[PDB]
Amino acid sequence: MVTPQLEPSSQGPLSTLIEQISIDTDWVDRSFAIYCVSYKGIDFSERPKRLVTLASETYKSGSVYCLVKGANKEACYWVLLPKDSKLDLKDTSLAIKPSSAAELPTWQLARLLIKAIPKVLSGTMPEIKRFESEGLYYLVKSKKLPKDHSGYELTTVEIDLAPCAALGFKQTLSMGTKTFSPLSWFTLENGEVQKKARFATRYQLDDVGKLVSKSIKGDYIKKPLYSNAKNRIQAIDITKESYSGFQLSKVGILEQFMQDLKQAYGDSVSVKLQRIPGEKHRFVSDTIVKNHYVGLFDALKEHRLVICDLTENQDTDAALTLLHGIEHLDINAEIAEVPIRGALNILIVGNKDTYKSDEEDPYQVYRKKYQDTVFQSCYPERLWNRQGQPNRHVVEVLLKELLIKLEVHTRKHLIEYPSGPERCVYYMPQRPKDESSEVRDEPWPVYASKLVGDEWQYTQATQEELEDIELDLGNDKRHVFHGFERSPVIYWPETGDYAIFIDTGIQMLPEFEAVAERLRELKEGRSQDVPIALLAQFIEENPESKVINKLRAILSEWDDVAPLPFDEFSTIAYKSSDEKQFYDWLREQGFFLKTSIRGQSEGFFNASLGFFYNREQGMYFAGGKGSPQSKIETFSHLYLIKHSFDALPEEVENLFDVYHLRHRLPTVTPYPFKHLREYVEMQRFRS
Amino acid sequence: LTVKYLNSRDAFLDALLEEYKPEARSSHFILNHYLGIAESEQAFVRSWLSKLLAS
DNA sequence: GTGAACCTGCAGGTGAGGAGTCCATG
DNA sequence: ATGGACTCCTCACCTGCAGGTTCAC
DNA sequence: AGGTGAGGAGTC
Ligand SMILES: [Mg+2]
């Protein structure tokens, strides 16, 4: 099989994939105790109740800091106890066997040293029962409950380890938001706890380290307030160059985690991350996208566009608003009371669930009858924003999608796409829309597209082609012809080659140590008040500088003896040529106030921009455009390409160069896989 | 008669909040947790409190 | 000689953001 | 009374102006 | 029945 033979790395983007874990086995074996509770070879068909009781009874007795579960086909479970400890269990259905701390896989042991010994890093053994569920939960936010209750809802960030199946079971970190709610909110007034909260693990807050931990006594359970909902914490934040706001993100807690493994273990255990090699990185500007979209709209100009309304209880000027939005782009449309045949149509419909089952849905009816016409639809609520103003973005999206279907219908491209590998056929599996299609292995139809001359040909793949593909796939046929999630494939008939693109799981991280050091220096600098004499000296020494006019103003409104604080310099920016010298001159004397952190020469914020491609390993990722902002809310992912090639063809690189699949952002999906996916949608109404 | 106009100062309040609860970590956390204002009502609060204490 | 493109990287974001009191009526 | 694994759900994005360089005629 | 991605809740 193929192994993840990466490189030791010297430079490049930083990854959440752990490179090496170092643990001193002597310091762990001589300081703790590991046992083994074997339930193998008893009965594999009577697992449920016996496993339940196994876990519960193993928790029942013994001073146990933590316990992890071993592999399903491996030795026992794994437990951690302090020195001179006992795992005495009365029942002998399972056998105990003391072992050492050098006989376990590294990640399992490191998980144990991450959970319970960092939570006890102040106090231990004060009571009978103690345990930590999983990970560490730091605190970032609290919210007050409605007036009828008491307490707060808490927001936490979780750090833990997990495997990565795509890269040979290599270890990855994780960071996730979890929410805690008080107990009384789920308990009825009659003392009857609701069914969900009757059996729930309880937790307790702390006032020193801001860590939520396990305890039998406590007024918190792990569940949100109302129902299925989401809470999230931003990735990074450098607003106004503050070091307090940088400490409350998902990369600020990660900096604290590395400072807590040092103050409890010293240098015995350390975690080192991996840098993916990279030499080809293409930043995308803003002008290129703009010029692309202009030519996008020009082609749509020379056609006919009709808007129709089919709501029952007609209300709102949705047609007028949409037409205004369209006409602001020099595209002229019209309003019709019934859809016209042979012209592009945008229809306004209602909620799909409302209409009865045998009711003849306007959309379905007016589709099935007119079978040579392109269609679009929208709900009337999406054209107005939160504050009532019209939403432009929706209008642009609708127009672009219309053009895509028109391109499919006419079988000839209208705008200049790049070129791709030739003599290849595109296959896409398609899940049945029947609700009975919960069968995992049930065969699916597969649709095929190809290019001959200048015309695309679309047809449903025959049985023979499907037999041909699976033979050459090999061990990779499971991703194409098996499972609840089936991925498309490009196939070469002459040589028997395939292309599959797989999401892996790594989130790209930017630099966070180098940013933190700078922010701390700025915080220390912005504490003192600058003396008046220094400013007078600067005025005398540089008569020609233009900044003087600003300075003289401030000094004229202030006391002649009291020192000047930082907030009086807000009117001068760090932008012009004569404005940089002033701040640098103050820096030489010990006053550091402003600096540059988002320059492209610095290279800190490069993991969230541009398009990145590595050919020999087949790794790529895409991010934003322009310049970094103060607030970023998502981490980019990492993808891998699986091939049977001796050397991957140089023509694949061109399929990721289209700027109208992610609406002004680079994409991570080939363009020929979009058109075909719009042909498997207008084929569910033909018959 | 002496007259003085007071602007907003954030570094003035930052240190004071830290001294009020010396065992915490940041300033926004102290303001949100021990005091009772959420993230929406933070800029306006900072604004008046700074001037009041400065006077 | 000049004025149109052309090319970085620093700021700033919906509105604005509360007490106190007189008199007649079934 | 317990742990870690698939499947379905909801939520956010889709900048902007100012100052220094440069051709293109 | 805007879209593509990145990601938090509820159970065998
Ligand atoms: Mg569609």
Coordinates of all heavy atoms in Angstrom, one line a residue, chain C residues 1-6, chain D residues 22-25:
Chain C
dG1 P 7.6 70.9 -20.4 OP1 8.0 71.3 -21.8 OP2 8.5 71.5 -19.4 O5' 7.7 69.3 -20.3 C5' 6.9 68.5 -21.1 C4' 5.5 68.7 -20.8 O4' 4.6 67.7 -21.5 C3' 5.1 68.4 -19.3 O3' 3.9 69.1 -19.0 C2' 4.9 66.9 -19.3 C1' 4.3 66.6 -20.7 N9 4.8 65.4 -21.3 C8 6.1 64.9 -21.1 N7 6.2 63.8 -21.8 C5 5.0 63.6 -22.5 C6 4.6 62.6 -23.4 O6 5.3 61.6 -23.8 N1 3.3 62.8 -23.8 C2 2.5 63.8 -23.4 N2 1.2 63.8 -23.9 N3 2.9 64.8 -22.6 C4 4.1 64.6 -22.2
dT2 P 3.0 68.8 -17.7 OP1 2.2 70.0 -17.2 OP2 3.8 68.2 -16.5 O5' 2.0 67.7 -18.2 C5' 0.8 68.1 -19.0 C4' -0.2 66.9 -19.1 O4' 0.5 65.8 -19.8 C3' -0.7 66.4 -17.8 O3' -2.1 66.1 -18.0 C2' 0.1 65.2 -17.5 C1' 0.4 64.7 -19.0 N1 1.6 63.9 -19.1 C2 1.7 63.0 -20.1 O2 0.8 62.7 -20.9 N3 2.9 62.3 -20.2 C4 4.0 62.5 -19.4 O4 5.1 61.9 -19.6 C5 3.9 63.5 -18.4 C7 5.0 63.8 -17.4 C6 2.7 64.2 -18.3
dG3 P -3.2 66.2 -16.8 OP1 -3.5 67.7 -16.5 OP2 -2.8 65.4 -15.6 O5' -4.5 65.6 -17.4 C5' -4.6 65.1 -18.8 C4' -4.8 63.6 -18.8 O4' -3.5 63.0 -18.7 C3' -5.6 63.1 -17.6 O3' -6.4 62.0 -18.0 C2' -4.5 62.6 -16.7 C1' -3.5 62.0 -17.7 N9 -2.1 62.0 -17.2 C8 -1.5 62.7 -16.1 N7 -0.3 62.4 -15.9 C5 0.0 61.5 -16.9 C6 1.2 60.8 -17.2 O6 2.3 60.9 -16.6 N1 1.1 59.9 -18.2 C2 -0.1 59.7 -18.9 N2 0.0 58.8 -19.9 N3 -1.2 60.3 -18.7 C4 -1.1 61.2 -17.7
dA4 P -7.8 61.8 -17.2 OP1 -9.0 62.2 -18.0 OP2 -7.8 62.3 -15.8 O5' -7.9 60.1 -17.1 C5' -8.7 59.4 -18.1 C4' -8.0 58.1 -18.4 O4' -6.7 58.3 -18.8 C3' -7.9 57.2 -17.1 O3' -9.1 56.3 -17.0 C2' -6.7 56.3 -17.5 C1' -5.8 57.4 -18.1 N9 -5.0 58.1 -17.2 C8 -5.3 59.2 -16.4 N7 -4.4 59.6 -15.7 C5 -3.3 58.8 -15.9 C6 -2.0 58.7 -15.4 N6 -1.5 59.6 -14.5 N1 -1.2 57.7 -15.8 C2 -1.7 56.9 -16.7 N3 -2.9 56.8 -17.3 C4 -3.7 57.8 -16.8
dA5 P -9.5 55.2 -18.0 OP1 -9.7 55.7 -19.4 OP2 -10.8 54.5 -17.5 O5' -8.4 54.1 -18.0 C5' -8.1 53.3 -16.8 C4' -6.7 52.6 -17.0 O4' -5.7 53.5 -16.7 C3' -6.5 51.4 -16.2 O3' -6.0 50.4 -17.0 C2' -5.5 51.9 -15.1 C1' -4.7 52.9 -16.0 N9 -3.9 53.8 -15.2 C8 -2.6 53.7 -14.9 N7 -2.1 54.6 -14.1 C5 -3.2 55.5 -13.9 C6 -3.4 56.7 -13.2 N6 -2.4 57.3 -12.5 N1 -4.6 57.3 -13.2 C2 -5.6 56.6 -13.9 N3 -5.5 55.5 -14.6 C4 -4.3 55.0 -14.6
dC6 P -5.8 48.9 -16.4 OP1 -5.3 47.9 -17.5 OP2 -7.0 48.4 -15.7 O5' -4.6 49.0 -15.3 C5' -3.3 49.4 -15.8 C4' -2.3 49.1 -14.7 O4' -2.0 50.4 -14.0 C3' -2.9 48.2 -13.6 O3' -1.8 47.2 -13.3 C2' -3.2 49.1 -12.4 C1' -2.2 50.2 -12.6 N1 -2.6 51.5 -12.0 C2 -1.6 52.3 -11.4 O2 -0.4 51.9 -11.4 N3 -2.0 53.4 -10.8 C4 -3.2 53.8 -10.8 N4 -3.5 55.0 -10.3 C5 -4.2 53.0 -11.5 C6 -3.9 51.9 -12.0
Chain D
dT22 P 8.1 53.5 -11.3 OP1 8.8 52.3 -11.6 OP2 9.0 54.8 -11.3 O5' 7.0 53.7 -12.4 C5' 5.9 52.8 -12.5 C4' 5.2 53.0 -13.8 O4' 4.1 53.9 -13.6 C3' 6.0 53.5 -14.9 O3' 6.0 52.6 -16.0 C2' 5.4 54.8 -15.3 C1' 3.9 54.6 -14.9 N1 3.1 55.8 -14.7 C2 1.7 55.6 -14.9 O2 1.2 54.6 -15.1 N3 1.0 56.8 -14.7 C4 1.5 58.0 -14.4 O4 0.8 59.0 -14.3 C5 3.0 58.1 -14.2 C7 3.6 59.4 -13.9 C6 3.7 57.0 -14.4
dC23 P 7.1 52.7 -17.2 OP1 8.4 52.2 -16.8 OP2 7.1 54.0 -18.0 O5' 6.5 51.5 -18.2 C5' 5.9 52.0 -19.5 C4' 4.5 52.4 -19.2 O4' 4.4 53.6 -18.5 C3' 3.7 52.6 -20.5 O3' 2.5 51.8 -20.5 C2' 3.3 54.1 -20.5 C1' 3.4 54.5 -19.0 N1 3.8 55.9 -18.8 C2 2.7 56.8 -18.6 O2 1.6 56.4 -18.8 N3 3.1 58.1 -18.4 C4 4.3 58.5 -18.2 N4 4.6 59.7 -18.0 C5 5.4 57.5 -18.3 C6 5.1 56.2 -18.6
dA24 P 1.6 51.8 -21.8 OP1 0.7 50.6 -21.8 OP2 2.3 52.0 -23.1 O5' 0.6 53.1 -21.6 C5' -0.7 53.1 -22.2 C4' -0.6 54.2 -23.4 O4' 0.1 55.3 -22.9 C3' 0.2 53.7 -24.6 O3' -0.7 53.3 -25.6 C2' 1.0 54.9 -25.0 C1' 0.8 55.9 -24.0 N9 2.0 56.6 -23.5 C8 3.2 56.1 -23.3 N7 4.1 56.9 -22.9 C5 3.4 58.1 -22.7 C6 3.8 59.4 -22.2 N6 5.0 59.7 -21.8 N1 2.8 60.3 -22.2 C2 1.6 60.0 -22.6 N3 1.1 58.8 -23.0 C4 2.1 57.9 -23.1
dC25 P -2.1 54.1 -26.0 OP1 -3.1 54.0 -24.9 OP2 -2.6 53.6 -27.4 O5' -1.7 55.6 -26.2 C5' -1.3 56.1 -27.5 C4' -1.1 57.6 -27.4 O4' -0.2 58.0 -26.4 C3' -0.5 58.3 -28.7 O3' -1.6 58.6 -29.6 C2' 0.1 59.5 -28.1 C1' 0.4 59.2 -26.7 N1 1.9 59.0 -26.4 C2 2.6 60.0 -26.0 O2 2.1 61.1 -25.8 N3 4.0 59.8 -25.7 C4 4.5 58.7 -25.9 N4 5.8 58.5 -25.7 C5 3.8 57.6 -26.4 C6 2.5 57.8 -26.7

